A paper describes a structure:
The only de novo biosynthetic pathway to generate dTTP (2′-deoxythymidine-5′-triphosphate) requires reductive methylation of dUMP (2′-deoxyuridine-5′-monophosphate) to dTMP (2′-deoxythymidine-5′-monophosphate) by TS. The TS enzyme is an obligatory homodimer whose subunits associate with nanomolar affinity to form a dimer that adopts an asymmetric conformation upon substrate binding. Inhibition of TS leads to the cessation of DNA replication and thymineless death of proliferating cells, which renders the enzyme an attractive target for cancer chemotherapy. Ligand-free TS protein binds its own mRNA and thereby represses translation.
Numbering used by the authors:
A (entry chain A), B (entry chain A): 26 to 106, 129 to 310
Write the structure that this text describes.
Amino acid sequence: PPHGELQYLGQIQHILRCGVRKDDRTGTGTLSVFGMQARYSLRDEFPLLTTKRVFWKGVLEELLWFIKGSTNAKELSSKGVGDLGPVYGFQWRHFGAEYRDMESDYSGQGVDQLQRVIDTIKTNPDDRRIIMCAWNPRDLPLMALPPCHALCQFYVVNSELSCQLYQRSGDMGLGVPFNIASYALLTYMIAHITGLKPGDFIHTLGDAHIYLNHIEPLKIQLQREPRPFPKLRILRKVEKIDDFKAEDFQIEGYNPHPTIKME
Amino acid sequence: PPHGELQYLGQIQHILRCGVRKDDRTGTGTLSVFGMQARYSLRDEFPLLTTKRVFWKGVLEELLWFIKGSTNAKELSSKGVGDLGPVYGFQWRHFGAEYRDMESDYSGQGVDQLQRVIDTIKTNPDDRRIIMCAWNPRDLPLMALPPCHALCQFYVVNSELSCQLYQRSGDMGLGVPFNIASYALLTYMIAHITGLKPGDFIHTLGDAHIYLNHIEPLKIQLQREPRPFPKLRILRKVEKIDDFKAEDFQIEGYNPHPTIKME
């Protein structure tokens, strides 16, 4: 019954082996392959990478911050890792909305994709349209109607909530393991408040790339041998998604390999 | 050097074998799997399925119609297979635009994603944002800011244009082979007018489904043995994408298996 982390790893080797040098926005070098996909069970397990230690706390507090729907950087650097622009959280909860500061009442503003997604699951779980999208701030002023950076399609069958994430770009060494843990968490959350059981998380990349300064660390991480994934426990019963707080989650069974810094 | 059609086929067997019954909008039955991906070379070949005959003409004339950016059904039923709503073509060329009839001058209106995509390739081919999106008409009146049905991310490296298509849903027996041929064509077109060489086409599905009334025909199509893919020739040199017409394309090397009707 093979390991899903064996996917991520394999993706790495491929981008290393058959990957092709490509320059990013900043003219920084990368090894790039176009179009990938990985499937990760959420059934009795949780995709917190083992081949290296993943900042689980920052993943949690970061998510909740998105769900709190905020634009306030200090509301995070004191919960783990002064106006911020409308990063994902603000989109998730009010896209279409006129963006003042971090402080004002946008209560009842724009479209609340995230509530909408939840709702749609309860109302019509066969729906092929349960989709949040998420922009890069850089893009907002840059042009009319810029393209999402990411989008999840959620999906439900036999009482099992699944989520597929599509990123136009994937930082494989630094970003990817994180998002895997994030959208896997998100899912778990939604599954929970909709009385559903977590299913698969599918991870689709456009440009999957590695930064040249990551190759070495990653070559070493490859030689590592994934311990079995942990589990994720919720310990209160929670009805509204804004009610979740960090207390509600226990990770259990997480013995990673040591941290691997990638700059 | 294996066949790409062997992918589509394999996807079929899986949805049959491990697929799970799910009800579509109309409460019609389907066998559904969530999250798939296939890669198809466009290098010296073209993904016109062989295990059955594909309506190549209708694929052509349909595309061109999109690119002509129209809302006029009769502009197609007399070129192959009275107002139509703003189907993909109109989005591709003017999303954001106020939609009158089929007849008016929307010249210079909304955002022309398709031109924009071309342009971005010439201006900044390392860009992670070369993305058109495409809506289902059904969805437009149905709610504020409905989710795309599809989106391509285009991508370029080593003088090779690639395209990945993401559909939230995939009709596997009827729709999928068609889109494969369509976005593969589109690509070829753009590659051509940007002095680029066609690369891969990646096909990502959310809900991949089969209609119960297709199972039998498909079970039979599985038993078939893919002949090698054809090629696609352009025979004029064309600079603007609105200049392409059906004359410009020869398919060569297409001996399919017989047509398979699926209702």
